[PDB]
């Protein structure tokens, strides 16, 4: 009663797709491993953000709309350029070093204790220089005025624009701690639903925020465009709130042991 | 003839990714899981609630289409937030309440009893206070008056809206009993089926009712607005006529045992 | 080196997620086996096309793009609704009938010997009256003229659109005939690619035929329109030489036996 | 403690759902084999391509945009027909060939040895002409002047065209390398990816360049038109470059032994 599984299909079966952090146990402080995952971080954050960056130069070509309103179809295309492009980046990117590629991810998996402190640190550091060269490069390789930089529109304050980027992170860490951290049948699968959420996650903000949800993203653009808003900080407050409520949630469904009906 | 499994990644295989509910025999009705179980409904529908409220608010700031004509791009916009938010929410939660996240289906899963009476009204009652807080929010933050409660429109009177909503409840609930509740090799990825079945029902919906598809979708926004239409009610019996189509499909199913050529 | 399966989740694994033809042998000829077949093409068909009925309806509500220009936004939200619609309903019914949902899906099926052809008459003329029920419920829940029936467009004339017909259909065909009806890893997950090979094929057919690709679509609007243009005949050769083409070119590759290098 | 697995079903658990690269071992070079490995080539490119021209033919019947702006929806059809279009090419593909439909691809795998170099050709030649077909049936099949074949736009000059097409092939190529070539849980599931990374790498450059990012896709159209602008060089050079970048970056994490903790 078990299926045949031919020698050389057992790599398929043997190598499980898994975030590189759940096997960073023992060994895993030597050069080598801090340098790996430092080069996952690298290429995945500059290939997400390069991406996505380019493609919201492009839809900011888009004709003015009148009266301050809405362009759905733009909208629809920025939040494509960063939630496929993360999702690209983290399905290359996740048995290096798991595919962040966005320090308020880190911050929740360090809280988490998925990731250690300083690792961590390395990660988050990593993710603002891949940032930085992301927004060089997109800015170099394209015509006109920086349009991928985050501000404020659509009639929000800095007050709402906080809140709309700290929920908005909490759902992308949320889909991280829940579908990648925690492991079952579905961890696998995990680079798909934190992309979904992302996407989600521009939806809600683009109009108002510009759609921070990850400081490395807000960071770059400003020093490529030498322009820093009073109001930065709630592309760094946010996020940093968000990673905390996700954390929170998460913190109590492990106290209550939460996929088991009897302890 | 086997591929070795190393024990480090024994929980992606042992640890199956199924609802809640597969799961809640004997144990089931302590407060501990009572809570588990409206902590997943809180969390999820609150989060895909909110999400999708905001999306809408900023989908409705497009310049208005003349002659009551429709616009595409608009719709395929709020129809993202709806069902790539549901599917979002219901990955997350999936391992803790189930993520229903919407009395029907709950309505349709106390039918096919696969959720006790009890803890489907607590599901349902905790649904309708998450809606309650994710329209109260997403008022909080955004400009403008609300924009996301549910109306007619597009020439549709009552009695068209109730049977729309009505069958795209019920593709909904049958989605959702026949990838979620049959056990199977793909009830693991139910939450994205369910996640398009969702979509599908607001591009059907949305132009025509606003497309409710969920009383504690419809209810909230009308509370945070302060406004009841009279015809709120298409939006409670359309959702139940729609389970008790989905149940009754699902039922002859069963009673057929439709997936065993000799049974 | 063999992980776990607790005995409440071996049927996540025993039940095979699988189209129900692949399991249609003996005992098969029964009355009760006949009407599984058929309950599952009717729930089906009439979901995906009353659905998709329904949203081309909406869509084409937009306002007129001058000098026969096309809507990219407009394509795009009908190309989901046959595309999304088509995936929900295979997912729904891939245990029961197997989906097929398309009289030319059934004929690429019965010459591939999948099913046998009582069978395969008895399920394409389901699928047509299911067609006419959506056509029918369609008209009804909405007002206006009915906008969803087939009509060549673009500029094309009746021999591109049968070429355009046979080819889109063929991609259809061709990918049920290697992703459901070859048997390996990702046949779970057909329904999944069978939407995306019809969403792809409206996206080339809508502008210049209606994008008929499946006789039941094409046939019940123009019942419900009372209007049968003269060139309706294009809606049924063009995807019966689509089901032929991906016939042949399956049934080469079997000949090939191209899965093994060594056969 | 282990599922039971029906006689039946196990053809969906032995047969593993592969690219056809990965067992192209002793036996391989018979002209059985190679003719397999064309055929898959042939036919997946041709439906891909084919599709997308049409695709692109239409979308770029939309009314033009003043002052040289972009058009996010039609931007999102065209993109849609590629990357959708390569997915459902793989997926059909994938056990015939490897599903590769790219020159630069193929490239990639020979620089990999994943595929030897005169195979490489003979897929890569196989491309080419199925690119020829795939132009001359789209424009055979559609009214009006080819609209489908590469230019510069956007403002984009020649050297920024290159490196967008550099950069958006590689992230196609490292896509291919990490989730089909390597061998793991994942593999099954490259064929989507890959389709995503078609999707936003057009995106990235449709507006600037055309998007080529495949040699086979520029030659054909050229080919049709009767037409080769002078930089076509970049849509040759560019991609070259790019399966060489992804080479290097996979490469290097080949060496440190990426996936391993402590080798
Ligand atoms: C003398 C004591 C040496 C202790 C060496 C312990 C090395 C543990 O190392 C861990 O092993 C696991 C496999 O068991 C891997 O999954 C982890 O990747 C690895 O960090
Ligand atoms: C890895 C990223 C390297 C990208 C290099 C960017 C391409 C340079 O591009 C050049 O920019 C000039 C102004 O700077 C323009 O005047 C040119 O005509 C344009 O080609
Ligand atoms: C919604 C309540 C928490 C978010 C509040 C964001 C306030 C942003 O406003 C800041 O408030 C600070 C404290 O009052 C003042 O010191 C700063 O000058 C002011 O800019
Ligand atoms: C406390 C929140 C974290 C902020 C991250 C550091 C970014 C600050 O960065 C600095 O912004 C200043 C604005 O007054 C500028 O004058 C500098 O130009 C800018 O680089
Ligand atoms: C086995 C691990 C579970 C730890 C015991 C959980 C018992 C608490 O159970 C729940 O606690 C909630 C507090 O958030 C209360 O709101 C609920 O009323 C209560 O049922
Ligand atoms: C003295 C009698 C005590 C009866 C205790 C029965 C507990 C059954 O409990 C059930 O066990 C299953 C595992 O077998 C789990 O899948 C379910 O989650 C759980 O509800
Ligand atoms: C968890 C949700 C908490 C969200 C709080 C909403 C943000 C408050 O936002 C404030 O609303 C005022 C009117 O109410 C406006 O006048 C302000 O300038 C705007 O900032
Ligand atoms: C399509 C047939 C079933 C749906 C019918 C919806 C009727 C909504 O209309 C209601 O009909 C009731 C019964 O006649 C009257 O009592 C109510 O006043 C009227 O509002
Ligand atoms: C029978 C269908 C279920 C309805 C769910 C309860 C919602 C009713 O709610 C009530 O609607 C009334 C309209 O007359 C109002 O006057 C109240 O303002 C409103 O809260
Ligand atoms: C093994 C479980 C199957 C129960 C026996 C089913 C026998 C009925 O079989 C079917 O019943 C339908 C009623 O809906 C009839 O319309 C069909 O003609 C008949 O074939
Ligand atoms: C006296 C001879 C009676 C012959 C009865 C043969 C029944 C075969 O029946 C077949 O069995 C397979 C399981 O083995 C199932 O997968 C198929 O669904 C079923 O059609
Ligand atoms: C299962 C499908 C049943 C759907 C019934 C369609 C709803 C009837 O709808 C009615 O159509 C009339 C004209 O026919 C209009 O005049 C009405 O005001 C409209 O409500
Ligand atoms: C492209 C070549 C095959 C498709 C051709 C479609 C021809 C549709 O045209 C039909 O051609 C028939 C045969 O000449 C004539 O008998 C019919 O009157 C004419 O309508
Ligand atoms: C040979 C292709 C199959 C055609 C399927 C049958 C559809 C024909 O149907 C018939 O079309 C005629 C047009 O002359 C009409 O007069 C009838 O109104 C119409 O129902
Ligand atoms: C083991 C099953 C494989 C059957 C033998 C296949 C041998 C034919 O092989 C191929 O046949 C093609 C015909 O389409 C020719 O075009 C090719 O040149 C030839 O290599
Ligand atoms: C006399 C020596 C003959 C050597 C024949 C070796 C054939 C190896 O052939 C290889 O076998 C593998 C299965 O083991 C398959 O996966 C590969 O597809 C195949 O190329
Ligand atoms: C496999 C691809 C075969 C496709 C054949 C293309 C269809 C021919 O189409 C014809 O093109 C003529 C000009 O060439 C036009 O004048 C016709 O009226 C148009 O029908
Ligand atoms: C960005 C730097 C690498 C890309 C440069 C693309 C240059 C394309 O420009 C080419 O440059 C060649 C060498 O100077 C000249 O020989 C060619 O005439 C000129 O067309
Ligand atoms: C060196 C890059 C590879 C180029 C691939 C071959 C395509 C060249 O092709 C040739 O382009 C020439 C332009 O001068 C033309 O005159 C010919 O018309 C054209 O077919
Ligand atoms: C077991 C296979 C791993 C081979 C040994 C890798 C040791 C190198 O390790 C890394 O090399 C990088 C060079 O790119 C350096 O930049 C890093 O500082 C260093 O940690
Ligand atoms: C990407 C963001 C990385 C988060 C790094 C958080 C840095 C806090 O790390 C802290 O860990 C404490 C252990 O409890 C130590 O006592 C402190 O010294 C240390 O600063
Ligand atoms: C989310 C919606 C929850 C549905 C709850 C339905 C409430 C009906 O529950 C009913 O169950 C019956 C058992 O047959 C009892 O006899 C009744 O007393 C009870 O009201
Ligand atoms: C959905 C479309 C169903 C296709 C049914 C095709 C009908 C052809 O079936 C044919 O089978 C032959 C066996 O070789 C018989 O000899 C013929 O009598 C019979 O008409
Ligand atoms: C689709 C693109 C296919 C790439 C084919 C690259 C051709 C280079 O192949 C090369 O291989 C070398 C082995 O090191 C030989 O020494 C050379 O003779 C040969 O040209
Ligand atoms: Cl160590
Ligand atoms: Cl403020
Ligand atoms: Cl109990
Ligand atoms: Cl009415
Ligand atoms: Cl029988
Ligand atoms: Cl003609
Ligand atoms: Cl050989
Ligand atoms: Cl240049
Ligand atoms: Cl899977």
Same mark, same amino acid.
């Given at each position: 009663?078990?299926a045949?599984?031919?020698?050389e299909?057992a790599?398929?079966?043997?190598?499980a797709?898994?975030?590189?952090?759940?096997r960073?146990?023992?060994?895993?402080?030597?050069?080598?491993?801090?340098?790996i995952?430092?080069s996952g971080?690298?290429?995945?954050?500059?290939?997400?953000?390069?991406?996505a960056?380019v493609?919201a130069?492009?839809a900011?070509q888009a004709?003015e709309?009148?009266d301050?309103?809405?362009?759905?179809?733009?909208?629809?295309?920025?939040?494509?350029?960063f939630?496929?492009?993360?999702?690209? =980046?983290?399905?290359? !990117?996740?048995?290096?070093?798991g595919?962040?590629?966005?320090? @308020?991810?880190?911050?929740?998996? $360090? +809280?988490?204790?998925?990731?250690?402190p300083f690792?961590?640190?390395?990660?988050?550091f990593?993710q603002?220089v891949?940032?930085?060269?992301?927004?060089?490069?997109?800015?170099?390789?394209?015509?006109?005025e920086?349009?991928?930089?985050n501000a404020?529109?659509? =009639?929000?304050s800095r !007050?709402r624009?906080?809140?709309?980027?700290?929920?908005?992170? @909490?759902?992308?860490c949320?889909? $991280? +701690?829940?579908?990648?951290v925690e492991?079952?049948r579905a961890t696998w699968?995990?680079?798909?639903?934190?992309?979904?959420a992302?996407?989600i996650?521009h939806?809600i903000?683009?109009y108002?925020?510009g759609?921070?949800?990850?400081?490395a993203?807000?960071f770059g653009?400003?020093v490529?465009?030498?322009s820093?808003?009073?109001?930065?900080?709630?592309?760094?407050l946010?996020?940093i709130?968000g990673a905390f409520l996700?954390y929170?949630?998460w913190?109590?469904?492990?106290?209550?042991?939460?996929?088991?009906?009897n302890?």
């Amino acid at each position: 009663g078990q299926a045949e599984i031919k020698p050389e299909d057992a790599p398929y079966i043997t190598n499980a797709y898994k975030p590189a952090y759940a096997r960073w146990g023992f060994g895993s402080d030597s050069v080598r491993n801090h340098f790996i995952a430092m080069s996952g971080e690298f290429v995945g954050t500059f290939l997400f953000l390069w991406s996505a960056f380019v493609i919201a130069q492009i839809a900011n070509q888009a004709p003015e709309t009148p009266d301050g309103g809405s362009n759905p179809a733009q909208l629809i295309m920025i939040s494509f350029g960063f939630g496929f492009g993360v999702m690209v =980046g983290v399905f290359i !990117t996740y048995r290096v070093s798991g595919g962040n590629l966005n320090p @308020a991810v880190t911050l929740a998996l $360090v +809280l988490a204790r998925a990731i250690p402190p300083f690792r961590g640190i390395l990660m988050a550091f990593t993710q603002i220089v891949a940032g930085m060269a992301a927004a060089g490069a997109a800015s170099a390789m394209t015509p006109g005025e920086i349009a991928f930089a985050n501000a404020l529109g659509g =009639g929000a304050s800095r !007050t709402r624009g906080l809140f709309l980027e700290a929920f908005g992170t @909490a759902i992308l860490c949320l889909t $991280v +701690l829940m579908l990648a951290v925690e492991k079952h049948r579905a961890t696998w699968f995990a680079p798909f639903v934190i992309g979904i959420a992302l996407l989600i996650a521009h939806l809600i903000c683009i109009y108002y925020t510009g759609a921070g949800l990850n400081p490395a993203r807000s960071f770059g653009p400003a020093v490529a465009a030498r322009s820093f808003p009073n109001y930065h900080w709630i592309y760094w407050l946010g996020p940093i709130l968000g990673a905390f409520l996700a954390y929170s949630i998460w913190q109590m469904w492990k106290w209550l042991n939460y996929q088991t009906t009897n302890p």
